[PDB]
Amino acid sequence: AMKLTPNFYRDRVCLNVLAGSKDNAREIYDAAEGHVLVGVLSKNYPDVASAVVDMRDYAKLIDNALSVGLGAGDPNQSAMVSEISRQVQPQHVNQVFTGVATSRALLGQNETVVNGLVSPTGTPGMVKISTGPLSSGAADGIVPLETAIALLKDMGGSSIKYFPMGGLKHRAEFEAVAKACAAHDFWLEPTGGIDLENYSEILKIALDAGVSKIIPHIYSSIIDKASGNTRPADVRQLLEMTKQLVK
Amino acid sequence: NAMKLTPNFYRDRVCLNVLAGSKDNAREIYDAAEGHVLVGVLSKNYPDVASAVVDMRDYAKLIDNALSVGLGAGDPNQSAMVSEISRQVQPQHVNQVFTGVATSRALLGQNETVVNGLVSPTGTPGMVKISTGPLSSGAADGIVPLETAIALLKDMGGSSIKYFPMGGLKHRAEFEAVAKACAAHDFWLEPTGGIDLENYSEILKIALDAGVSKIIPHIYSSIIDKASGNTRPADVRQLLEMTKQLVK
Amino acid sequence: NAMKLTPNFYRDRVCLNVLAGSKDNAREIYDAAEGHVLVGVLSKNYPDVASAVVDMRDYAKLIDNALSVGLGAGDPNQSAMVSEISRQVQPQHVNQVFTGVATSRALLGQNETVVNGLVSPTGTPGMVKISTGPLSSGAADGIVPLETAIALLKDMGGSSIKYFPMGGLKHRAEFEAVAKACAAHDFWLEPTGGIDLENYSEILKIALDAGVSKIIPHIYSSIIDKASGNTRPADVRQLLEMTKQLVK
Amino acid sequence: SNAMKLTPNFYRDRVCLNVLAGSKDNAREIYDAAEGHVLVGVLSKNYPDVASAVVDMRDYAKLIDNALSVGLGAGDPNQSAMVSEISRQVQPQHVNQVFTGVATSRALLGQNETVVNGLVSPTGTPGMVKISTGPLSSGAADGIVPLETAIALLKDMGGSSIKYFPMGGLKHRAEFEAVAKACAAHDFWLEPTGGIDLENYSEILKIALDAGVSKIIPHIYSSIIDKASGNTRPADVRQLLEMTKQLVK
Numbered sequence: 004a005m006k007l008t009p010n011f012y013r014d015r016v017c018l019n020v021l022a023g024s025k026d027n028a029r030e031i032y033d034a035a036e037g038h039v040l041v042g043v044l045s046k047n048y049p050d051v052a053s054a055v056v057d058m059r060d061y062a063k064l065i066d067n068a069l070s071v072g073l074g075a076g077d078p079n080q081s082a083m084v085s086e087i088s089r090q091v092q093p094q095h096v097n098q099v100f101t102g103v104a105t106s107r108a109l110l111g112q113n114e115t116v117v118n119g120l121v122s123p124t125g126t127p128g129m130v131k132i133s134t135g136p137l138s139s140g141a142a143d144g145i146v147p148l149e150t151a152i153a154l155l156k157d158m159g160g161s162s163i164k165y166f167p168m169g170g171l172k173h174r175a176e177f178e179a180v181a182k183a184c185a186a187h188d189f190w191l192e193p194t195g196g197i198d199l200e201n202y203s204e205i206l207k208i209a210l211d212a213g214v215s216k217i218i219p220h221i222y223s224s225i226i227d228k229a230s231g232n233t234r235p236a237d238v239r240q241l242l243e244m245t246k247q248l249v250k
Numbered sequence: 251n252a253m254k255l256t257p258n259f260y261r262d263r264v265c266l267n268v269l270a271g272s273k274d275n276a277r278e279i280y281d282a283a284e285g286h287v288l289v290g291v292l293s294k295n296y297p298d299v300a301s302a303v304v305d306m307r308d309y310a311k312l313i314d315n316a317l318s319v320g321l322g323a324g325d326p327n328q329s330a331m332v333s334e335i336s337r338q339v340q341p342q343h344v345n346q347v348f349t350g351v352a353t354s355r356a357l358l359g360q361n362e363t364v365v366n367g368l369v370s371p372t373g374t375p376g377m378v379k380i381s382t383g384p385l386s387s388g389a390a391d392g393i394v395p396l397e398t399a400i401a402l403l404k405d406m407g408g409s410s411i412k413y414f415p416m417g418g419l420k421h422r423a424e425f426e427a428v429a430k431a432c433a434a435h436d437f438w439l440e441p442t443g444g445i446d447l448e449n450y451s452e453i454l455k456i457a458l459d460a461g462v463s464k465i466i467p468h469i470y471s472s473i474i475d476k477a478s479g480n481t482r483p484a485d486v487r488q489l490l491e492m493t494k495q496l497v498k
Numbered sequence: 499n500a501m502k503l504t505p506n507f508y509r510d511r512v513c514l515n516v517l518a519g520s521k522d523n524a525r526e527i528y529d530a531a532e533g534h535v536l537v538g539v540l541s542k543n544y545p546d547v548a549s550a551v552v553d554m555r556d557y558a559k560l561i562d563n564a565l566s567v568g569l570g571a572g573d574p575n576q577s578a579m580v581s582e583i584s585r586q587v588q589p590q591h592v593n594q595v596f597t598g599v600a601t602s603r604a605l606l607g608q609n610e611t612v613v614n615g616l617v618s619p620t621g622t623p624g625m626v627k628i629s630t631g632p633l634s635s636g637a638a639d640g641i642v643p644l645e646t647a648i649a650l651l652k653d654m655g656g657s658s659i660k661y662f663p664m665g666g667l668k669h670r671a672e673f674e675a676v677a678k679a680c681a682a683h684d685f686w687l688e689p690t691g692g693i694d695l696e697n698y699s700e701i702l703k704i705a706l707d708a709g710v711s712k713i714i715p716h717i718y719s720s721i722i723d724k725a726s727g728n729t730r731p732a733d734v735r736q737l738l739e740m741t742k743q744l745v746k
Numbered sequence: 747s748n749a750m751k752l753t754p755n756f757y758r759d760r761v762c763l764n765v766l767a768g769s770k771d772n773a774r775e776i777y778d779a780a781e782g783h784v785l786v787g788v789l790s791k792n793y794p795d796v797a798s799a800v801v802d803m804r805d806y807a808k809l810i811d812n813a814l815s816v817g818l819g820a821g822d823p824n825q826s827a828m829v830s831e832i833s834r835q836v837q838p839q840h841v842n843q844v845f846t847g848v849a850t851s852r853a854l855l856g857q858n859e860t861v862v863n864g865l866v867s868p869t870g871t872p873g874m875v876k877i878s879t880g881p882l883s884s885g886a887a888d889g890i891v892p893l894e895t896a897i898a899l900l901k902d903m904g905g906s907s908i909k910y911f912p913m914g915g916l917k918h919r920a921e922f923e924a925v926a927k928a929c930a931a932h933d934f935w936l937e938p939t940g941g942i943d944l945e946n947y948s949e950i951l952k953i954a955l956d957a958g959v960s961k962i963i964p965h966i967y968s969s970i971i972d973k974a975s976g977n978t979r980p981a982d983v984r985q986l987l988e989m990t991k992q993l994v995k
Contacts, residue, residue: 101405135405144394157349157383631902640891653846653880
């Protein structure tokens, strides 16, 4: 009735794409047959109260399939995202490593999916966890994937948001992230450089590894720069490539 | 009209942290330290949140809220319980594992209570282990530079590093690096493990000499009478005395 | 920042209080009233304090903290429970019996949440029954002048009189005296019992004309669908419009 | 706590004196003079803030096994909030409150052992008591209720006893006899206060004993206080103790 979990296609994959407008949010939700989380960014609002009002309105248009975003990769939006999420109660929240537990605490329930941003390092098996407001300005803090997953679980997280993935430029690092998420019972949100031409290959890496639930994020490659909207036809194409792989 | 939510540091620099074995022991400790103490009561010593909250509220009132809510081993499986207890009790101080700092801060609902975060030696000065939570403590070690551990803890609402198990003076160089980093990066330090009356001044002086703004040494087993379970008030008086001789 | 702890009065004068039958109903009520409502959730619909706290915190988040913690038909046996629930939830509004107002205020720990106090008709305009607590409701009636009831409630941390059971307009002279006293002695008024769409304007206008500064009318059974137990959002829209017409 | 008990030391589970101390020395002398069957009053109005009252009162209490009674200083009602806040930290055996402060003090104490009285007053009509004794309510028209109801109200608000003040000694004898009868009938404690002196103490105490009130805490202030020093005379406390032993089997 007010659903707090995402609509995974055959309990495996849910798309995450950005809305350019309220009408675009509705377009996107229809194009994905509901198997999507529609991103709205906190950086687009000057203050928490302003964002709560507007994001509730978005959420109501799409049966709560909202993903609260940071925006422009800015970790300084973390606190705002946590406070917005408390009142909005969306299906999905994007956080930096140091904001996951705060968002989980302010949500007050375990149903909403809360990701935690960790980054490639150039060394398969090791990820950067120093992705918060001050920690992003410090020397890198880099830990094994197993350990990043356990840290995120201990902090109320649901998934790794692996960013910037670099499309297929760093295949070995991405393979290791998928292997670790499968081995340690955690979900994965691949983000950065995904487009219509590499989507199937990227998704299949995570499916083949045995990751239980996967939320690919597809931003700039499917956004019409003239309007700022995510293109419905591209959403339909992503859905069909997903159905072809998840069977 | 609420009770005070921040510790009573001696000359804005040092506050002792010691365990109570009883309500009367807590009163005697608080007197012996002239108020410059946080008295630890352990969540693991109660069967449920409600029994901890009721008892710890009473401890707190007797000592003007100079209560430190403990895990009870730095035990990470007590983390969620400590966060809920602390929410309801509203103490001056909370002990957390790395993965519980933000939860405790969020549930406290205010920025005054001091919340530590447990990070640990690695064998390599400058590098600390942050994988101290329930599941992370069983995973491969997650080790980061001190600057980064401090920034991570600040981002998560923490006030200080609880550096444990410090090993007394067995790993002096690692401890010196911790104190240096807390001074350089404007963070507080809570040295814990192996402190006794004979090494207290040396250990405290490392942190003072480094320039750490606020220091909360924890002194547990060496000052506890095993027959009663009480911290010895005379040992607290001596700890205060040694503190005064170094801080002026 | 914590959520807002005071009600959202329409033109600083009137805030509706109606009951939610579900989480969705709370959301619909809040929309229907354009935010000028306190959505009641009854303690009696939970078996224990924690159960109530967990659910009411979720209600509150969905409606920006515009929650009213209910006894359940003014039941004094729910008073202690409501005081502890309210301490943990931190709502905008609390319903209390006369002997629970101070306890709720003390446990809330702040003066922003509105706490009402139940006092009742006697048959004599100007005199109200204050013996509305668990044991005092079973004793001979304690009956005092309105001025005195107001001063007692203020002294005990109360914000308003909950005047119950008002009987719609059946005791209009007594209600007119309550409104006059609240205006004269600078206190708020919560008319409760027998309010419906046919008498609402007249009842509200008695309080408005008397000069009561803040009024929180409670409208329960007349606007509740018996099958679902939900307050009809259309009736909340109607109540809001009747309020706007009277509060220019 | 074990070393600082929260309930008064009643003589033969029946009577505990309540008198004011003018100094820590005077508190010790009083406590000795009463053989421990006393609550020593220290007044909130003698401190500029809660913090200073807490420090000093905690030191008083430590000298006398926690036999401390936190006072308003007048039955004064504007001290009510301060008394509640002091008591939260002091955790005394006894707290004086006005009618509107009983529940606040109980809530801030956090436990049910400390005795919290509630001031209610004569009306000229035996059986009826004035409950409007708080900061603003004391200035309103009188709120008068039956004794049964006043007791039930105080119980509902976490109270332990009625502080019946101002008694004017035996001036309100019939009213006081009815208060004692009601407290015995409704299982509540009684703290007679106002105008008690060495000449009327036995008769006043015996009214309450004869009625069957289960715990009685008489308050004896001005008649036993040396004005020049501000100290309660320990010799007067010894006399009051002996009068109590003569009446309590």
